[PDB]
Structure formats: structure tokens, C-alpha cells
């Protein structure tokens, strides 16, 4: 058995998404584009942090 993570806070803007994360222990974040070019990215998160995409 493995645990599951807490919900983040999401706000909206013109062609962008802003997220605020609340980690308790190291967690992995990843995203990709759908379509012809995936543009993969990967990052480990160990403390409170804010990101824009």
C-alpha cells in the first residue's frame, strides 16, 4: 500500500495556469503537451513552491 497526495490550489489567467503545492514528503511533478511535440519535463518537490505554465 502507498499513500495519495493533497489537493492543490489553482487560479486562471490568459493562456496560463498557476498552482500552489503543499508537500509533506518528496513528490514527483511532470507534464507534457498533447499533439506532435510532447516536450517532457520532470521535477522533484520537497517544500512549498509556486509554478506557472
Amino acid at each position: 500500500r502507498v499513500p495519495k497526495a493533497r489537493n492543490p490550489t489553482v487560479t486562471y489567467g490568459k493562456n496560463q495556469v498557476t498552482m500552489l503545492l503543499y508537500p509533506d514528503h518528496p513528490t514527483l511533478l511532470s507534464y507534457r503537451n498533447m499533439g506532435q511535440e510532447p516536450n517532457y519535463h520532470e521535477e522533484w518537490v520537497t517544500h512549498k513552491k509556486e509554478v506557472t505554465l
Binding site: 498533447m34 499533439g35 510532447p38
Partner: protein, 439 residues
């Protein structure tokens, strides 16, 4: 009656088509795609797992010289050392204080755990395809399932369906793949019989039940320490353990076009590429004659609201006068506007209501209800929400779709400039003709 249509490869969006047969009332069908699956053909090459080392007890011979013979076991080694003087818990082992020797040997085998923890290498070939559909037929939902090529036919309620072939041959798998407990990787594994001492493929076998094992690890025996009985050695560590700690991201998280991956059996689902043609054969008893269907004689249209969002943001009201009670179909005559409703019930003198969605800034379109047509027009506003969680239900725009006020301004500027050229040219023609005639 045979009918042919083309449907784009998008999941979760309904589409409609019109069937028109002379002498009969028109009919409208609705179709929606639920899943598409690809499945390749696979062949096994070899498997890998962890290894074990076997060391039997040393042989100590005092006041003499020993020797060893060759054997056929994998990675076999023997060596003889001189000048040894071993001890035990009660005192020295042998009486002689010189001319003693020691013999040591070892070889490599396959671990017992290979029946549970292993990885397998495959070679892939051309894949097949399958699809499943939902069709709205005479007021009921029916489901069909078939292969996505022209070599299969199915019959449901006396209707025959044939689907495929697909427009594209794109696949997310290469020639060489590797599978381990639900993950698929693209990797160029080394040839059989050509392994490496510290990378993937040091131990190779053809099947978990086989007895032949190939090994290419390094094994060198070293000198024992003074006063001790033991068999020391040097060897490169296992390569299978190293791969597990640094294998990286799987194919599911990196593949393009939004495909999903499953492994038992290996499949890829919901890749949005290409389009799929469809053919349907409708029997004669399903049609209704034009003389039995009701007739509608007078119409008018009004549009109280429009917002060109990604959802159904329109409403329309149409007035009609009907000759008798019955059923009727509704279908749009333009490509940029889509109408949700499929049919209506008409009686007496009343009105009906519909909904539509479009991307146009200024909306003009025609609506057909039981062989007559009406003209509608209205103006539309933009929305306020920036981001949503579902795809659009309308098609894209071209260069010809421009607001009516914008087109008016283009006409005045272009026309005005052109007149100045027109008047200037007439003066030139006259002057040359006069000069020609005077001479």
C-alpha cells in the same frame, strides 16, 4: 440503399449525417466513437536475471605440491599458491613448516529467483486495429464492434456495417522493446552472445526453463591472507540491479498524441490521428412515403441570445403551421453551425425551440424542417472564462468568415481608390487620340 460517410478520429464528440432518397422523407443518423485499440505482433529473443557464485571448500596439502585439471563449467578458474601456514582454533594444522600448497576454484550459475524477477526482450512487427461505436437508430441506441479494416462485416437489426481502413500507419513502438511488470521501454539491447561485464545483458538465457547459460563477468582469484583459511576473489557487480535504479521514465509518460499504454497484452489506446470511413446499408422497410408525412406551410425565425462559447450557447424560436400530427427531422444547411436536436413533433399552430453552437461573430444560416427552409440571423458576444476542461464542439473558421461591419469598411476603401485610377485613365486615352488625329 448504400450510404458512405467519413468521420474524424476524435473520441467523445457526436456527429450527424443526412440520408436522402427520392420519393421518401429524409432521415438523420447520429454516431459517436468510444474506443480505438492498436495491437502489434511480438516475438521473444531472450531474458535476463541475477546470478549466483559457487565456491567449494579449499584443499590444503602440506609437504607436497597439488595440481588441477580443466572443466567445461562457465567461468571456471583454478590456481595454486605456495608458502602457506594455516592455523585453527587449537593450534597449527599440519606438522610441516614449509612446502605447503593451497588449491581454490569457483564457477558461476543462474539464480533460483529468476522464475519471479526477470525482464524480457521482444521484437515488434505490424499492428492490427479495432473499434467500437454507438449509433442512434430509429429512436434507440445500438452498439457495434468490428475490426478496423474492410474484411469484416456485422449485422444488427437487419442493418449491415463495414468500418475501415484507417488513413494513417503511425505507431508508437519501434523495432526493439523491453517489458517489465507493466512498463514498456525503447532500448537497443545487445546481441545474443556478445554481452558486457557491467551493463544490461551480462547473463542471457532463452527461456526460464532452459539449462544453457552464457556469462561474461570477470572473476580473478587472489592470495589468501596470512594465518587464515578463506577464498577471496574479485568480480564486477550485477548489471540487472544497476538498471533498476536508473531506468528513467516509461513510455506512458513520454509518448505523443496522448496515447495510453497497457502491457497484458501490449496495447495502445486512444491515439488521435487520421480519420475513419464508414459504410451502411439500410433496408427498404425503414422509410416513410412523402404522402404520409405531415406538411408545414409557414415559418418565421427569431434569435433572442447568442454567446460563442465552446458549449451550446444559443437559443432559437420558430413558428409553424402544420397540416396534421406527425414527426419531423431538423438539419442544418451550413458547416459552421451545429444543432443538437435530431427530431421534433408537430401539431396544429404552435412553436418549437432549439439550441446551437458556433464560432462566428455574426451568424447567418438556414434550417430545414420536413422539406422547407427558413432564414435566421443574429449577433453574438464573447465569453469571460479563460480555461475549461473539455474540447470544443464546433469546427474552425476560414478567411471568408468576417463580421458584417468589417466587410463594409473594406468595400468603401477599395472602391474609392479604384475610381481615382478609372478617371485618370480616361484622360490619357483621349489625349493620345487627339495627338494621333492632329498629326
Amino acid at each position: 440503399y448504400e450510404h458512405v460517410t467519413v468521420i474524424p478520429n476524435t473520441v467523445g464528440v457526436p456527429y450527424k449525417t443526412l440520408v436522402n432518397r427520392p420519393g421518401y422523407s429524409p432521415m438523420v443518423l447520429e454516431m459517436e466513437l468510444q474506443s480505438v485499440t492498436l495491437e502489434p505482433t511480438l516475438s521473444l529473443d531472450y531474458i535476463t536475471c541475477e546470478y549466483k557464485t559457487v565456491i567449494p571448500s579449499p584443499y590444503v596439502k602440506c609437504c607436497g605440491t597439488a595440481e588441477c585439471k580443466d572443466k567445461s563449467l562457465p567461468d571456471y578458474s583454478c590456481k595454486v599458491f605456495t608458502g602457506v601456514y594455516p592455523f585453527m582454533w587449537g593450534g597449527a594444522y599440519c606438522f610441516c613448516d614449509a612446502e605447503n600448497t593451497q588449491l581454490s576454484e569457483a564457477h558461476v550459475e543462474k539464480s533460483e529467483s529468476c522464475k519471479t524477477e526477470f525482464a524480457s526482450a521482444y521484437r515488434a512487427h505490424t499492428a492490427s486495429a479495432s473499434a467500437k461505436l454507438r449509433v442512434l437508430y430509429q429512436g434507440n441506441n445500438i452498439t457495434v464492434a468490428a475490426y478496423a479494416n474492410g474484411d469484416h462485416a456485422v449485422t444488427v437489426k437487419d442493418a449491415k456495417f463495414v468500418v475501415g481502413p484507417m488513413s494513417s500507419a503511425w505507431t508508437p513502438f519501434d523495432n526493439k522493446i523491453v517489458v517489465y511488470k507493466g512498463d514498456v521501454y525503447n532500448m537497443d539491447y545487445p546481441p545474443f552472445g556478445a554481452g558486457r561485464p557491467g551493463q544490461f545483458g551480462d547473463i542471457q538465457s532463452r527461456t526460464p526453463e532452459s539449462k544453457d547459460v552464457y556469462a561474461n563477468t570477470q572473476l580473478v582469484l587472489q592470495r589468501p591472507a596470512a594465518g587464515t583459511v578463506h577464498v577471496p576473489y574479485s568480480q564486477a557487480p550485477s548489471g540487472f540491479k544497476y538498471w533498476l535504479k536508473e531506468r528513467g521514465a516509461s513510455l506512458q509518460h513520454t509518448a505523443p498524441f496522448g496515447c495510453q499504454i497497457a502491457t497484458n497484452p501490449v496495447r495502445a489506446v486512444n491515439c488521435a490521428v487520421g480519420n475513419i470511413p464508414i459504410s451502411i446499408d439500410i433496408p427498404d422497410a425503414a422509410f416513410t412515403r412523402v404522402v404520409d408525412a405531415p406538411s408545414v406551410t409557414d415559418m418565421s425565425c427569431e434569435v433572442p441570445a447568442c454567446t460563442h462559447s465552446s458549449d451550446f450557447g444559443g437559443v432559437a424560436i420558430i413558428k409553424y403551421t402544420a397540416s396534421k400530427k406527425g414527426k419531423c427531422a431538423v438539419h442544418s444547411m451550413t458547416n459552421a453551425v451545429t444543432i443538437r436536436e435530431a427530431d421534433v413533433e408537430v401539431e396544429g399552430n404552435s412553436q418549437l425551440q432549439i439550441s446551437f453552437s458556433t464560432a462566428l461573430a455574426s451568424a447567418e444560416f438556414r434550417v430545414q424542417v420536413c422539406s422547407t427552409q427558413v432564414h435566421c440571423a443574429a449577433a453574438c458576444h464573447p465569453p469571460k472564462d479563460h480555461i475549461v476542461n473539455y474540447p470544443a464542439s464546433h469546427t474552425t473558421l476560414g478567411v471568408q468568415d468576417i463580421s458584417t461591419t468589417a466587410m463594409s469598411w473594406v468595400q468603401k476603401i477599395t472602391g474609392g481608390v479604384g475610381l481615382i485610377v478609372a478617371v485618370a485613365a480616361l484622360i490619357l486615352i483621349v489625349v493620345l487620340c487627339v495627338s494621333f488625329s492632329r498629326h
